[PDB]
Nucleic acid binder design. Sequence first.
DNA 1: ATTATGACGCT
DNA 2: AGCGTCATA
Length: 430
Amino acid sequence: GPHMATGQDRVVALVDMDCFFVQVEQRQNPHLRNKPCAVVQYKSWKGGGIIAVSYEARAFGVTRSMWADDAKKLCPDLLLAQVRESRGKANLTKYREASVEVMEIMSRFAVIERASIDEAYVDLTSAVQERLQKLQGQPISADLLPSTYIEGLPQGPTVQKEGMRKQGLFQWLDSLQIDNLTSPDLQLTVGAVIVEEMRAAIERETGFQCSAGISHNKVLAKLACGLNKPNRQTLVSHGSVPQLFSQMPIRKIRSLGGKLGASVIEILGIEYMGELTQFTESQLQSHFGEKNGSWLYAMCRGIEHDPVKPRQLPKTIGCSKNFPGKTALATREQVQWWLLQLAQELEERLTKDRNDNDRVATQLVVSIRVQGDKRLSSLRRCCALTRYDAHKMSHDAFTVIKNCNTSGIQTEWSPPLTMLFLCATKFSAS
DNA sequence: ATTATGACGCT
DNA sequence: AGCGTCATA
Ligand SMILES: [Mn+2]
Ligand SMILES: [Mn+2]
């Protein structure tokens, strides 16, 4: 245990915007503020599909992946904002641009890894070292942590939520050894001070509220972020992990929400993350492979080494559209019209990207789905991307897929297409 | 008939 | 390269 690496070398934060597309719409339209509201795409089919939900609306049981007509049954006064439509399809440009606003603010504090349209990881290790020296070994005042929860506290020997939060924070700060500049708990605490500042800057400069997690790695930071949403941040210390994990369903951990997580549970006969500690690393590797087993063995002990990648920008720019049920594309001209629609939005986004970010895509991926099939994608073919023009891209896309047509006559398309996807990839500096 | 994305791992 | 998994609004 002298040599037992603690996995406490880094301070990592995860910042995630609260109900993000909803906040974007509420900033634009003040009538939606502090109301049960949701963001919907399309409208004809069952009122449209919900993709974001305000906390007021979640109180009524409204969720994402709910049809708006069904959501209105739970919440009759639900207000709805519609995703823009351009060239016959949902267009997410407003939310992508809002995301850039937030990411550029975070980048003033540290290197960030864009993890989704509305969240980024922050490696704060260096910022913390600097703030620690600025500090002088003064105590950290509760006043510097006005929206911070310390997971696991208060504990040991009032019934208000904010009262509980301060109780826990006071116990944490009372215990801290601010004397030691290499203390991991102290380092997390200064990390949280910086994230309060970052979150204040995001709200001041965009109007958007967010939550955050602070811990020693990405998985714990992501988990921490969720603990006290909305508009709060949570510090998960190395020490808080045994109790936290002792009743944490395995599926709650990032990457375990799917088939792998289900196989951990079934094969091992366990339910909670903490139960993993009873297996040897070799045992876990035998069941889940070398990489996953090593990852699980360390992760259940609160340790993970995945770095925060310095990447603020998406690696791919894609445009996709489903043609569900009876709207499936059964005609050549239909297929070519929609490929052009997709290609025109792609050209628009690619040109904007080239101007803002000094880079050019070099590969065009074309993906389709066929009726009665499978899975999200039936077939994925790549071809060169040499020019940002929609007509070339759409013609090229048709070329690589046109032989998928089992149809006897080339005017018809069989079996009908239920999805088209164009994705630009393999960016190079330009 | 959730839809529209976007990253990463496997072979 | 093409496929599959996991994730987010
Ligand atoms: Mn969010
Ligand atoms: Mn998110």
